[model samples]
Each structure stands twice: as C-alpha cells, then as structure tokens.
Target: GNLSYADLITKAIESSAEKRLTLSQIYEWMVKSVPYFKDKGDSNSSAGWKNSIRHNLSLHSKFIRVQNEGTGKSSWWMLNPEGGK
Candidate 1:
C-alpha cells in the first residue's frame, strides 16, 4: 500500500472551474475529496502533506504552471494537455 504523493496531486489537480487552479484551491479539493486530507489540512494541524503538494508541483513534469492574468503572487496549475512527455 504505497502510492506516491504525485498520484494524489495528479488526481486533485484534475478539477477546475476553467481548467486551472491556484495552490489554495488545490488544497481545498484535497481536504474535501480525500480522506487523508480532511484533518491533515486543518490550519492548526501539521502541514507535511501540504508541503508535499508544493514539492510535487515544483518537480512533477506532468503538472503545468501558468501566470495569473492580473498582477499578484498568484498562479494557475493544470495538467499538460500535450501529455507529460
């Protein structure tokens, strides 16, 4: 029973209002859609898994990052439609 953290993020980032999501939105989905994140996502609880999300987004090639339209420290992340390869 050993799934990589990438699988969780891969599934979590698959939803969206327009095809992309900010980091905060991705976190919200994990807490609501998955069992492991419900309590792990609490503001006062430990944030190791949340940090895992960051690392996955940073290193995972299949996940793509885009700059927000307006100016701010925001981003839009989504799957690479062209395929991860």
Candidate 2:
C-alpha cells in the first residue's frame, strides 16, 4: 500500500504514543529507526539514508549512526497529519 507520508506519520504517532513523546520526539525516533526507500542513482539516496539515522542536532549529527556523505540539501519532511485522508 502506497500510504502518503502524512498518513504514515499519523500511524506512527498513534503507534508510538505509548512512549509518551510529542510530535517532534516521535519524528526523531522514526527518523532514527525507519529505513527510507532510496535508489542507487539517487543523488540524495545516501544523504537520505544518513539523515534517517539521527535527528538534526545543531546542524550536526550527535551520534553518527551512518556515514555522512554530504551529498546535498534535502527537505526533511515528516508525514503531515492533516495533509491527506
């Protein structure tokens, strides 16, 4: 099922509520754990993969989970709760 990012975020919010984290916190957790889909030729594929590892801490990764390739700038977006049905 091709669920929109917003919908997936909602599901994540609902699923992660047990941890008592705010939207931002939940987002951080999801970013750290969830494996985003990327392709080999994706310019930001490596970047996206790295970004998925840790939250943007002061524009620098606190504890690097993945190597930083510094490919390019990306619009870090989470699933918008109300953007879709």
Candidate 3:
C-alpha cells in the first residue's frame, strides 16, 4: 500500500499486517513512516501527534485494542477485518 501522508489508522494497519502491535509499536511506525515525525524529540514537538494517536485508537472502530492476559503486558492493537472498508 502506497500511503503517503497516511492517517494514524492506515499506519497502524500497515505495521500490524503480520501481527498485532501495542500502542508503543504504533508510535514507532509513525516515526518511521512519516517524515514529519521522524525528528520528534523529547520536546513538545510531538505532543499533538501523540494525542492524535491515542484519539484515533479510541475513536475509530476499525482499530481494536486487545488486552494481554498478563497483568503487566501491554495491550495489542489490530484492524478489525470487518470494520474497515
């Protein structure tokens, strides 16, 4: 998929094609996929982008958050095959 300037959902799906990823992995994908966020440092530069990532995960039905069995493990995110176009 040639997704230039792709939205959060798109990047999430792209990164999770083989297997589901956690929220942390999605953030890593965004940094690798989009050039704008490549240089996102510890400063306030990426505050909004980080917020949008969380927002998209919660707002979009296409993305599903699956809980890990262990108490300390991170939840995994995946595209709901029937939820997307």
Candidate 4:
C-alpha cells in the first residue's frame, strides 16, 4: 500500500521502537514497509523516494537525531512522542 510522507515516518518510528535505528536501518525499513520501494537498487525507482525519506528525516520535528555515545559509531533516529503532534 502507498503511504503518505507523514504516515511513512510514523511507521518507521514504530518499527524501531524496540531500539533506535541507524539511518541505514531506516532505509531498510522503508524498503520493507513500502512495496513501492522494494526496488531500491534501481535508481529510476528509488531516486526521488530516497531523497524524500532523507528530507523528511531532517524536516520533521517529530524525528529526533540521537548522537552515538561511541566515538566512531553513527547516530540513531528516534521519534518524539510529544513532538509528533
């Protein structure tokens, strides 16, 4: 099923609620959650979709960026329950 941009983010956040997900995991969830993005390897298929995902991650206030405590690890992304409103 096709989902709106906001819907997608909500789903993504819930998918990782057990633990924070890295950016790559988010992409993995996107590809898994939306059948439309299953063909992520095809540039023609994922070009705009990937960018939109990236844009939403930064543009939305509900999505929070968590810094990695380890020196070289990447940060995690989490949802701010209060901010989602």
Candidate 5:
C-alpha cells in the first residue's frame, strides 16, 4: 500500500460497507489487513503508528469527514473521489 499511510487509509475506508469508517475502525483495519503492520498490533506500538494515521486524517485533502449527526461525537471518514485524479 505504498507505506505512504494515505494509501493504507484509503484501503481501509474503501472496503467498508458504506465506503467509510471511524478512526478506530480504520486503525484496526490497518493492523488486520496490512502486512507491514501485522506484527505491530500491540497497543504500545500502535500508539505511535496510529498517531501517524490520525495525523494524515487531519491534514490530507483527499480524506473528508462526514458528520455522524448523532451521539458519540462520531464522524465517518470518506474518500474524496476527485482527489484520486
């Protein structure tokens, strides 16, 4: 997935039922699906890497946030179709 983090994030959300997912869902998907992160599942290791994930989510323009509009202060992270081109 390029180890670019952006690619990993895209892979996670794109495969979701709604093509979107939450922060935790995205992180877990990376750990479960990415071979690079396969051996880094512990919370301690995950802490730093997950922060990278969150930082990418925070700054990257290709990612967009859709408000959950309800309880739990949730929001769905989605791909910006235009960002790929």
Candidate 6:
C-alpha cells in the first residue's frame, strides 16, 4: 500500500495518528526513496559538488540540503536529482 511518497505519507499519517514520526524515520524514508541514496555509485568527485547541492536542493537558501541522510553532516557529495552533486 506504500510504494511512493504519496502512499507513504498517507500510511504514515494514518499509522501515527496520535504520535509523530521520529527524525530518523523521516530521514530514512527521504534518503532511500529520494535521489541521493539511489545514485551513490555515480561520480563522486565534482568541482561543483557543494555549490550544486546548495543550489539545486536548497535553492534560495531557505533549505540547506546535506550530503547523506543518515548523518547530519558528511563528506559525501549528494544531489537531489540525477547526476552527482
């Protein structure tokens, strides 16, 4: 019943009607299903890795996307879409 974000969110909302999700669970779901985890074997060395991520994932500075989802801060390059950041 939970294949995509829509389904996952729906199930999560239903399942946790009383309690909220932990940061770990939310981060876990985002990483595994999002663009970073799926594209880890790509080019790891990029001159614009940091800037690209800061631009693409965060955009106007409202958000600052991290490299890996498990850790708060890591030394890996992460992107929101295809291609390495």
- Per the 3 Å backbone cut-off, how many clashing residue pairs does candidate 1 have? 0
58-78 in candidate 1: lDDT tens per residue? 898888899987686769888
Best candidate (score: lDDT): 5
Judge candidate 2 at residue 31 and give its lDDT. Answer: 58
Cα RMSD of all models vs. native, in order, equals 2.5, 12.0, 3.6, 2.8, 2.4, 11.5
Full candidate order by TM-score, most accurate first: 5, 1, 4, 3, 2, 6
Best candidate (score: TM-score) = 5
Q: Which pairs in model 6 have colliding backbones? A: 49-85
Across 1-85, the per-residue lDDT of candidate 4 in tens digits comes to 6677757866887866465677777777877767777877446425787678778878888888899676748688788868765
Candidate 1 residue 56 Cα shift, in angstroms, is 0.6
TM-score of 2: 0.31
The lDDT of each candidate is 0.77, 0.39, 0.69, 0.74, 0.84, 0.37
lDDT tens string, model 3, 22-76? 7777777777766676787343535887777778778777777899666858897
Kindly list the per-residue Cα lDDT of model 2 for residues 1-85, writing each as its tens digit: 3664433444554566342334344455455545653132233425552344333322332211222235533323343334332
What is candidate 6's lDDT per residue for 1-85, written digit by digit as tens? 2264333433332344432344244334444555643454343335233234334333432222344555654422222233222
Candidate 2 regions with alpha-carbon error over 4 angstroms = 17-20, 37-85
lDDT of 3: 0.69
Cα TM-score per model = 0.79, 0.31, 0.72, 0.76, 0.81, 0.23
Collision count of model 4: 0
What TM-score should be assigned to candidate 1?
A: 0.79
User: Candidate 3: lDDT of 72?
Assistant: 53
Q: Which residue segments of model 4 deviate by more than 4 Å?
A: 17-19, 41-46
